[PDB]
Design a protein around this ligand. Structure first.
Ligand SMILES: *[C@@H]1O[C@H](CO)[C@@H](O[C@@H]2O[C@H](CO)[C@@H](O)[C@H](O)[C@H]2NC(C)=O)[C@H](O)[C@H]1NC(C)=O
Ligand SMILES: *[C@@H]1O[C@H](CO)[C@@H](O[C@@H]2O[C@H](CO)[C@@H](O)[C@H](O)[C@H]2NC(C)=O)[C@H](O)[C@H]1NC(C)=O
Ligand SMILES: *[C@@H]1O[C@H](CO)[C@@H](O[C@@H]2O[C@H](CO)[C@@H](O)[C@H](O)[C@H]2NC(C)=O)[C@H](O)[C@H]1NC(C)=O
Ligand SMILES: *[C@@H]1O[C@H](CO)[C@@H](O[C@@H]2O[C@H](CO)[C@@H](O)[C@H](O)[C@H]2NC(C)=O)[C@H](O)[C@H]1NC(C)=O
Ligand SMILES: *[C@@H]1O[C@H](CO)[C@@H](O[C@@H]2O[C@H](CO)[C@@H](O)[C@H](O)[C@H]2NC(C)=O)[C@H](O)[C@H]1NC(C)=O
Ligand SMILES: *[C@@H]1O[C@H](CO)[C@@H](O)[C@H](O)[C@H]1NC(C)=O
Ligand SMILES: *[C@@H]1O[C@H](CO)[C@@H](O)[C@H](O)[C@H]1NC(C)=O
Ligand SMILES: *[C@@H]1O[C@H](CO)[C@@H](O)[C@H](O)[C@H]1NC(C)=O
Ligand SMILES: *[C@@H]1O[C@H](CO)[C@@H](O)[C@H](O)[C@H]1NC(C)=O
Ligand SMILES: *[C@@H]1O[C@H](CO)[C@@H](O)[C@H](O)[C@H]1NC(C)=O
Ligand SMILES: *[C@@H]1O[C@H](CO)[C@@H](O)[C@H](O)[C@H]1NC(C)=O
Ligand SMILES: *[C@@H]1O[C@H](CO)[C@@H](O)[C@H](O)[C@H]1NC(C)=O
Lengths: 226, 312, 210, 146, 48
């Protein structure tokens, strides 16, 4: 069942990516930004900045040195300002990209090369594993996560009383279907009979709040009686 | 800090306020105006994204049941107070009360009331269902038993919690009371937020003040130049003013870009804290308050979030 | 008063809306100021009455549209103005025109501001609404009840992350003074700018490879 | 400029270049030939008609002559010693021989000496205001002689 | 053609390599431009 669910999920990833392009927005955005910053830069060549023309050869071919100097100073100021703007924008944007890349590296270490216990760092769920996939100017992680799905109410209790002692579960929780008490692991309903192998003893019954009564089965007694 | 003020500036109106000669000169500079607008719009959209990423971390809006039987823990000071107009808690009210030319301020996409609803949802989930509502469907669990899990998470056996339930609940209540007192008494606690506010305020005062400057022109006022000089010379004076004011705008936008990068870093950290800290129990040392992390409670605040980290 | 006018008082000019003020100038004070050295009030030279200056209403004009691939019908947002100055709806964000106000709340499709989003929905038209934060739900909390999952699912989620940019380089000299000696010799007067820009861009490109 | 290693050393301002790859210069091919193409016209522009006109118009009703479809040898003008003022805006007189234009307008008139200064971009006075106004972005030459 | 040259067409100066083009200029269109608003193609003043 698990293998089938995983295969189905990967198929769904195929379908989603084949159908809709918008999925890769985070990447496309980057591309677009840089594209714009370059279009802008190039367009700023066609500007006059108060000179007689935006083209340099026209000024050079029309004026004498004493005046072409002034016009070219105007153009130089303008274009140098445009370059400084572009370089500053690119520095800031590269800092943002470096942050994304550091996060991507951290994800590939803690997420792909390992199993992360950090919540929502490796997809919404309990992280199982992740698979990296290259992409233009970026990376794509497929995060495989375990998501609890069908849930049931149960009456519960923090301990039980056997012989005036209090038994707490070793790993799991005490639950009740209404009639009998069981103990089960807390992330998947697999009820088990409450025994001394499933629980430990601490103190007495006059302290814990919400404690109940049940019988704790001792595995040894049947063997001794038999 | 999570978000900034979504400021916008009309480069044209800022430089050449309601002046045609000035505007016609400004046309010669090309796309500077557009790119400044674009950068600030980037910032404002980023601000909305920051707030979304931090608070809209829960799909459903949980609400607590009318019964407040949380094994003797008391959450009245952090759950929403129904009597108030804005559905905010006592501590959120304290925090909100502890913070105080072509320029427009765009409003945030989520209102304070929605931020408070998101925090209320997170808080109700964390209380009634523990960490399960981060994983997927919220699964109820008694709060005492949740705390027993949170004790098992830091290597203390669950009997300790059950056997010391009254004492632990009392300590927690006392601590929340101390938080109330701290916020009522000292304002400096919210420095990190106030600072942000002040910074942006300053950056705008500065921007506006740079209009009163001459930059080597005959006057800082544009109509005076237009009404006093002939076109051939008014053009030179206005070019001086335009250069000055355009430089001032570029300065302001660059500073805002850098500051938005700083705020985005803080907001990414806040989102990580709300995921790893609120929606879970973190084993990372000192990421969720000095102690062994037990749980954390978020609380909205002007342009930011506040975590109450409960630690053992 | 109460109109956008181009006013000129004894020395000072401006454009704004002049309104009856409640300020208390001193007998000698002529015109008032804001924190930001901005004129906010004047005294009429002929009648010793004080007038507040409110700048003539202005703001961004934003167009809300589904894709042209979907529809050619759009809405307009006049930002932070009233609906007077211009199927009309006043919102905390400004005046919204061409969108139907709806009581039903939905997931945010096109953000407008202050909790109002818009979308294109069914006879189809554009609608505005207070956006819904999610399905409201209460959890069956009680001191002795626990929900445990009996089954599970395997989800595969996609997380996309940008890693590198385009390693652009610009020859500052050729960009400013393309193949020109007079221009290059003029550029030399600015010092190290060319080198500094080249260096920054080279830093970026090496960072991208890293 | 001796060798590429020397270009590197000079770029880094050091004698002890560390291992790496360094951007030093910019390669650019040099043009081999000069190409000049103009439309094959043989027609002098009728400048005589304008400058050697027997009688001139009043400044208020200044005459305008259009020049088109001809070869303009401006040396004949700027090398003549007959002109007291030869002031060219947005162009240098020497360069005029090397330039083409769609149209030329020869605006001819007569004024008195002290008003000649008013025939220039952005001037003020009776002439510049009420008679003949040049634009602030005027691109051409103003020629005047007693 | 096919050489780096310093060209002047009707005052339009530049430096480049001139090649036979395949652009479908209209009978009236004099020279062409690229996305950067720079001269990309010309019509010889002497030859169409
Ligand atoms: C709670 O669980 C117990 C144990 O699984 C159920 O008791 C069993 O019921 C089946 C038939 O339903 C009988 O065949 C067994 O003999 C019972 N086991 C024991 C140990 O007595 C009980 O029915 C469940 N109660 C509810 C309400 O579902
Ligand atoms: C759980 O079991 C214990 C022991 O059977 C119960 O303690 C008894 O309580 C009753 C009611 O007060 C007394 O009559 C007995 O004397 C108690 N026995 C002992 C040994 O103390 C306890 O009441 C049970 N819990 C519940 C909820 O009934
Ligand atoms: C949880 O704590 C709050 C805060 O101390 C308690 O609210 C106080 O309750 C008393 C008794 O009704 C009132 O006299 C006070 O006015 C309340 N304080 C405030 C600030 O309003 C509340 O009683 C506690 N809840 C429980 C169940 O003990
Ligand atoms: C300027 O002139 C006007 C008119 O001469 C003055 O207004 C008059 O003020 C008196 C005193 O209040 C009134 O009785 C009259 O009705 C007003 N006349 C008019 C035509 O409005 C005004 O006071 C003068 N102000 C100054 C500063 O000299
Ligand atoms: C756990 O959930 C899965 C999927 O929801 C269940 O597997 C489905 O079983 C039904 C009926 O047997 C079939 O119609 C589907 O085709 C199955 N899906 C897959 C992917 O195998 C499974 O029955 C559930 N397990 C329990 C114990 O309830
Ligand atoms: C548990 O019970 C409550 C009411 O007692 C109900 O609202 C809820 O749906 C139940 N949960 C499940 C998973 O059946
Ligand atoms: C649980 O809640 C019920 C109903 O409010 C109450 O009667 C009972 O005392 C509580 N028991 C525990 C152990 O909290
Ligand atoms: C418009 O959208 C549909 C899907 O909604 C898509 O198939 C189509 O390619 C789009 N139109 C164009 C011209 O791309
Ligand atoms: C719009 O105009 C009316 C009348 O001028 C006024 O009552 C109302 O307050 C205005 N709305 C806003 C949001 O200012
Ligand atoms: C929507 O709500 C307003 C205010 O509550 C009310 O006046 C109006 O009748 C409602 N419209 C519909 C269709 O319910
Ligand atoms: C105008 O006349 C003078 C003297 O008669 C002569 O030198 C000059 O060449 C003439 N200009 C022409 C022919 O363009
Ligand atoms: C002059 O140019 C025309 C352009 O149509 C051409 O037909 C003719 O051959 C050319 N003649 C000479 C001598 O260049």
């Amino acid at each position: 069942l698990i293998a089938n669910q995983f295969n189905s999920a990967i198929g769904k990833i195929q379908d989603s990516l084949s159908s809709t392009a918008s999925a890769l927005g985070k990447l496309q955005d980057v591309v677009n930004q840089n594209a714009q910053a370059l279009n802008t830069l190039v367009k700023q060549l066609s500007s006059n900045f108060g000179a007689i023309s935006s083209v340099l050869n026209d000024i050079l071919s029309r004026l004498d040195p004493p005046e072409a100097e002034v016009q070219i100073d105007r153009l130089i100021t303008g274009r140098l300002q445009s370059l400084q703007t572009y370089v500053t924008q690119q520095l800031i944007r590269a800092a943002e990209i470096r942050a994304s890349a550091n996060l991507a590296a951290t994800k590939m270490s803690e997420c792909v090369l390992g199993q992360s216990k950090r919540v929502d760092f490796c997809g919404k769920g309990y992280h199982l594993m992740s698979f990296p996939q290259s992409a233009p100017h970026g990376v794509v992680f497929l995060h495989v996560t375990y998501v609890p799905a069908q849930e049931k109410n149960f009456t519960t209790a923090p301990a039980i009383c056997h012989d005036g002692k209090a038994h707490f579960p070793r790993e799991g929780v005490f639950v009740s279907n209404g009639t009998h008490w069981f103990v089960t692991q807390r992330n998947f309903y697999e009820p088990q009979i409450i025994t001394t192998d499933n629980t430990f003893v601490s103190g007495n019954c006059d302290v814990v709040i919400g404690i109940v009564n049940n019988t704790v089965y001792d595995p040894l007694q049947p063997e001794l009686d038999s | 800090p999570v978000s900034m003020t979504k400021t916008s500036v009309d480069c044209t109106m800022y430089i050449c306020g309601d002046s045609t000669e000035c505007s016609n000169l400004l046309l010669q500079y090309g796309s500077f105006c557009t790119q400044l607008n674009r950068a600030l719009t980037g910032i404002a959209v980023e601000q909305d994204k920051n707030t979304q990423e931090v608070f809209a971390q829960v799909k459903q809006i949980y609400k607590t049941p009318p019964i407040k039987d949380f094994g003797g823990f008391n959450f009245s000071q952090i759950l929403p107070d129904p009597s108030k107009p804005s559905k905010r808690s006592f501590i959120e009210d304290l925090l909100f009360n502890k913070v105080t030319n072509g320029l427009t301020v765009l409003p945030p996409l989520l209102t304070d009331e929605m931020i408070a609803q998101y925090t209320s949802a997170l808080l109700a989930g964390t209380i009634t269902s523990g960490w399960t509502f981060g994983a997927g469907a919220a699964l109820q669990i008694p709060f005492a038993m949740q705390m027993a899990y949170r004790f098992n998470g830091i290597g203390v056996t669950q009997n300790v919690l059950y056997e010391n339930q009254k004492l632990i609940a009392n300590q927690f209540n006392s601590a929340i009371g101390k938080i109330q007192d701290s916020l009522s008494s000292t304002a400096s606690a919210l420095g990190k937020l106030q600072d942000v506010v002040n910074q942006n305020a300053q950056a705008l005062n500065t921007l506006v003040k740079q209009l009163s400057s001459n930059f080597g022109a005959i006057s800082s006022v544009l109509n005076d130049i237009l009404s006093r000089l002939d076109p051939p010379e008014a053009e030179v004076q206005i070019d001086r003013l335009i250069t000055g004011r355009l430089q001032s705008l570029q300065t302001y936008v660059t500073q805002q870009l850098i500051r938005a990068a700083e705020i985005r870093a803080s907001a990414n950290l806040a989102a990580t804290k709300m995921s790893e800290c609120v929606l879970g129990q973190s084993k990372r040392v000192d990421f969720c308050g000095k102690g062994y992390h037990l749980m954390s409670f978020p609380q909205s605040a002007p342009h930011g979030v506040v975590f109450l980290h409960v630690t053992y | 008063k109460n109109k956008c006018v181009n006013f000129n008082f004894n020395g000072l000019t401006g454009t704004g809306v002049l309104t009856e003020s409640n300020k208390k100038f001193l007998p000698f004070q002529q015109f008032g100021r804001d924190i930001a050295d901005t004129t906010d009030a004047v005294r009429d030279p002929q009648t010793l009455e004080i007038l507040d200056i409110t700048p003539c209403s202005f703001g961004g004009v934003s167009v809300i549209t589904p894709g042209t691939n979907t529809s050619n019908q759009v809405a307009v947002l006049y930002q932070d103005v009233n609906c007077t100055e211009v199927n009309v709806f006043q919102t905390r964000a400004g005046c919204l025109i061409g969108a139907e106000h709806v009581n039903n709340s939905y997931e945010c499709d096109i953000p407008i501001g202050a909790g109002i989003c818009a979308s294109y929905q069914t006879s189809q038209s554009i609608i505005a609404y207070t956006m819904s934060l999610g399905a409201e739900n209460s959890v069956a909390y009680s001191n002795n009840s626990i929900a445990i999952p009996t089954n599970f699912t395997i989800s595969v989620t996609t997380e996309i992350l940008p890693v590198s940019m385009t390693k652009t380089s610009v020859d500052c000299t050729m960009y400013i003074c393309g193949d020109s000696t007079e221009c290059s010799n003029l550029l030399l007067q600015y010092g190290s700018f060319c080198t500094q820009l080249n260096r920054a861009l080279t830093g970026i490109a090496v960072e991208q490879d890293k | 400029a001796l060798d590429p290693l020397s270009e590197t050393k000079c770029t880094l301002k050091s004698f002890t270049v560390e291992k790496g790859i360094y951007q030093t210069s910019n390669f650019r091919v040099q043009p081999t030939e000069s190409i000049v193409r103009f439309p094959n016209i043989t027609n002098l522009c009728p400048f005589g008609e304008v400058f050697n006109a027997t009688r001139f118009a009043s400044v208020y009703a200044w005459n305008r002559k259009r020049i088109s479809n001809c070869v303009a040898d401006y040396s004949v003008l700027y090398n003549s010693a007959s002109f007291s003022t030869f002031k060219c805006y947005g162009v240098s007189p020497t360069k005029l021989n090397d330039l083409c234009f769609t149209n030329v307008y020869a605006d001819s008139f007569v004024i008195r000496g002290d008003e000649v200064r008013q025939i220039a971009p952005g001037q003020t006075g009776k002439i510049a205001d009420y008679n003949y106004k040049l634009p602030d972005d005027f691109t051409g030459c103003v020629i005047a002689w007693n």
